[PDB]
């Protein structure tokens, strides 16, 4: 019933270390399987790019 998305605030997104750490963490923190999802597609794509 509740999903979540990333903010669009500039600044912290241009910071590489935070982006890489978040990209590593998110694959273990959330679930986007075949039964239910917690993430929108855009956020999953952003974490994949990270």
């Amino acid at each position: 019933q509740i999903i979540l998305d990333l903010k669009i605030d500039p600044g912290e997104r241009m910071d590489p270390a935070v982006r890489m750490v978040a990209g590593v963490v998110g694959h273990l923190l959330f679930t986007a399987g075949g039964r239910f999802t917690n993430l929108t597609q855009n956020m999953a794509r952003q974490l994949d790019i990270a």
Partner: protein, 50 residues
């Protein structure tokens, strides 16, 4: 409307431009939605109400 469509604050999606340089003359998105119908044409009212 063309300026709003072509300005992206998220991850960019693909776009295919047409031959002419008229505004809104492109196809945008994975499913290739045609945006030529939104250009004004007073004979039929293609882009607005009616």
């Amino acid at each position: 409307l063309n300026d709003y469509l072509l300005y992206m604050y998220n991850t960019r999606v693909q776009v295919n431009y047409g031959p002419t340089g008229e505004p809104l003359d492109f196809q945008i998105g994975r499913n290739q939605y045609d945006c030529n119908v939104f250009r004004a044409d007073f004979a039929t009212g293609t882009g607005y109400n009616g």
